[PDB]
Structures are given as C-alpha cells and as structure tokens.
C-alpha cells in the first residue's frame, strides 16, 4: 500500500495558477470612456495621411521625456505613414497654446515625432479625437 493517493479533480486550481505570456485583448465595455479613462481606437478608421498605432498595452504612444535634468520633451512614437503631415498638424494645434511655433524633431527612420516641452496630456486628448 503506497503512502500516496492520486487525484485529478483538483488540477483545475493548478491550471488557474498558470500565467499568460500574451497581453489580453481589452474587454468590450457597454459605455465609453471606461472609468479608468481608457477608450479603444474608433471605427471607422481615421482617413488622415498618418496613422498612430497603439502600444502592446493598448495605450496611446505618447511619452514625457527629460534629458540633462532640464530639457523637457514629449514624444509621439508609433507613427506610420506621412510623419511630416503629423508635424504640420501638431504645430498648428500647439501654436495657439504656446503663442509661437513649437520646436520639433522628426525621426523618419524610427517613426517618432519629438516636441520640446511637455504636451503629453494635450496630445493624448488630441489623438483620441482623431480616433487613433
């Protein structure tokens, strides 16, 4: 008589423990915006010359950055299409707020647009309206 008895019933609790390797697709919500604030990209697709893709976490790829301890910048990263058209729109959108044209860098190799100063919240709201 062995000292061990084998059961398969309780393996469900073992399966529950396995972690995923894939970020789950966000669940459908009845009412948007979601209480956290997240809203999925709109359908139909925007018809602009440039497309801004979402991150693997399903968020808008706008990031505040700082270098040298004093140079504040904001980055729009996953841009596909005409990155110069986006620069034109960004300058017009941000010009009234500044009172002057924003200083920007276009990295056509990496597909990112860099702006001097922190404008992440305005650009995050701005890009939601366009439906990206």
């Amino acid at each position: 008589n062995p000292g061990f008895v084998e059961s398969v019933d309780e393996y469900q609790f073992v399966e529950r423990l396995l972690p995923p390797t894939k970020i789950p697709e966000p669940p459908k919500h009845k009412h948007y915006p979601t209480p956290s604030g997240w809203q999925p990209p709109r359908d139909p697709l925007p018809s602009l010359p440039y497309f801004v893709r979402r991150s693997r976490m399903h968020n808008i790829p706008v990031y505040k950055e700082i270098t040298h301890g004093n140079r504040q910048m904001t980055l729009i990263r996953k841009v596909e299409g005409d990155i110069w058209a986006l620069q034109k729109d960004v300058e017009e959108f941000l010009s009234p707020l500044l009172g002057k044209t924003p200083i920007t860098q276009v990295n056509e190799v990496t597909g990112t647009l860099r702006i001097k100063g922190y404008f992440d919240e305005q650009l995050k709201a701005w890009l939601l309206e366009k439906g990206f």
């Binding site: 972690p19 995923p20 390797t21 894939k22 970020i23 693997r56």
Partner: peptide, 10 residues
C-alpha cells in the same frame, strides 16, 4: 509576431 503583444517574462 508573438514577440510583440507579449508580456515580459515572469
């Protein structure tokens, strides 16, 4: 394609 849309490894 698995490499994008994946978590970091636990």
């Amino acid at each position: 394609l698995w490499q994008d849309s994946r978590y970091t490894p636990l």
